[PDB]
Amino acid sequence: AVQKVVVHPLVLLSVVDHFNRIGKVGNQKRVVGVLLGSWQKKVLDVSNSFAVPFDEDDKDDSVWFLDHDYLENMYGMFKKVNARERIVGWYHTGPKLHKNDIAINELMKRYCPNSVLVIIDVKPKDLGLPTEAYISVEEVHDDGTPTSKTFEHVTSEIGAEEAEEVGVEHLLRDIKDTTVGTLSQRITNQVHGLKGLNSKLLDIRSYLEKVATGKLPINHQIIYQLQDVFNLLPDVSLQEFVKAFYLKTNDQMVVVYLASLIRSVVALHNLINNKIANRDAEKKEG
């Protein structure tokens, strides 16, 4: 149904507010906020959101506390001031997906339309993208397990339309723009290996752990496609790609001729002014 979503940083800075207005009480649980957006178009666009007092139990996980009057009053006043945005779903700040999320999401599945779920981290130490759109749809399983709520990952992007780019750029004054060239390219080409190294290294350890020490079926069926796609590149002998290395290396030669020739053109004004300026300033100095 929905291919991609658009999440503005305003809601995540509202999660920064979720971490600001705590008051140093010692709970810092998965505070659930009421996510708002535009479900009209096929693409999802989050503009702003708000929160609702949400408290769980220490031992029992099935305890969840929501509010209908606060949702209808905040949504009623927010719709009165801005009727272009309506309820879409919710989101929790907890890093782990608990079992009670089917009951928490089920309320906004009954009263509200199909709600999207977003799992983020309480500490911004994760290098990866903090936002993951998880659609709440029921899928048929091939093994015969009963139909249950399934959270499929929907791709997400963090973009701002008109003003939030200007506000973020003014508040930071440290981040740089695209700036194609040497630095913005070589930084990605340096740290990209760590950007994949922390992800893959962080995933395959618990993966290999759950291979031998795993039960409660984790959908082993998708592991066959996992190792299949991993074995779709069986160390090609590079025999056919030699001519492609001749093509890319020939373009490299083109960059060599462009650099040497163009820089040789740049040497004109320098290697002329260095003489005509020094000898004339010297002969005319005294």
Partner: protein
């Protein structure tokens, strides 16, 4: 300015806004897995950029 003046304005930013918003904006200019759109340009150098290299020349 008569009977109508103004006041100075300063800002404030803690480490949670600095790292969450900074990494959020860098990620807003980066990719999902950060390895997706690299080979796109690495292999577009042979298909599309060649036109930009000929026009550049």
């Amino acid at each position: 300015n008569r009977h109508y003046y103004s006041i100075t304005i300063n800002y404030r930013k803690n480490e949670l806004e600095q790292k969450m918003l900074l990494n959020l904006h860098k990620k807003s200019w980066m990719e999902g897995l950060t390895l997706q759109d690299y080979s796109e340009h690495c292999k577009h150098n042979e298909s599309v950029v060649k036109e930009m290299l000929e026009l550049a020349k």
